[PDB]
Amino acid sequence: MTEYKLVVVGACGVGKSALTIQLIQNHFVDEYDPTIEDSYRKQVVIDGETSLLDILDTAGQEEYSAMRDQYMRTGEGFLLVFAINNTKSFEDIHHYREQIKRVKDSEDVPMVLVGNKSDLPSRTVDTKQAQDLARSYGIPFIETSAKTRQGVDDAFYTLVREIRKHKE
Ligand SMILES: *CCC(=O)N1CC2(CC(n3nc(C4CCCCC4)c(-c4c(C)ccc5[nH]ncc45)c3C)C2)C1
Ligand SMILES: Nc1nc2c(ncn2[C@@H]2O[C@H](COP(=O)(O)OP(=O)(O)O)[C@@H](O)[C@H]2O)c(=O)[nH]1
């Protein structure tokens, strides 16, 4: 068995907590306290290998902190989450990624770009725009809906596969 320390990053209101809770416990949270930052664990079987996902759902303040750098440095892989109906959250991805590259002191950190809220028709971020951004970073792009659970397992398992390719 292998342990994977994952970190979920993205602006307030993109669905980091909803995605994390859908993954760990299979239910959709309509509202979840934006101040609650916690780690959640779930044992899953990925590609026949038993894996333990230790997932840090970031929250709190959008400020620089050396203590936050310590928690980020423990992450092996990062889910970069934006909402497909919130262009600012998509534009913020570049800035969260820059902070992670700084803390990890590497240009090759395992990451997956996640376009959440795919069930909504009020889309403002084109699939082509998000695919182009993910290609520019050399990382996978996955569209998810924490509401219907579509793409949720794929998002986290894809990040685990990225960590495996990086370790090898
Ligand atoms: C509504 C609460 C919520 O859900 N939040 C997610 C969160 C934004 C997130 N966050 N912001 C930053 C920095 C982005 C650039 C300006 C300073 C804040 C980070 C971050 C990262 C990704 C890496 C290292 C680091 N060190 N200090 C801050 C960071 C994060 C995780 C928190 C508010
Ligand atoms: N329709 C829809 N709403 C979502 C989805 N994910 C989150 N939400 C809603 O968006 C809001 C913010 O979600 P939350 O998990 O609190 O975002 P966080 O601030 O990134 O942790 C909540 O009202 C959620 O119910 C989704 O995939 N589809």
Ligand SMILES: [Mg+2]
């Ligand atoms: Mg913002």
Ligand SMILES: [Mg+2]
């Ligand atoms: Mg949250």
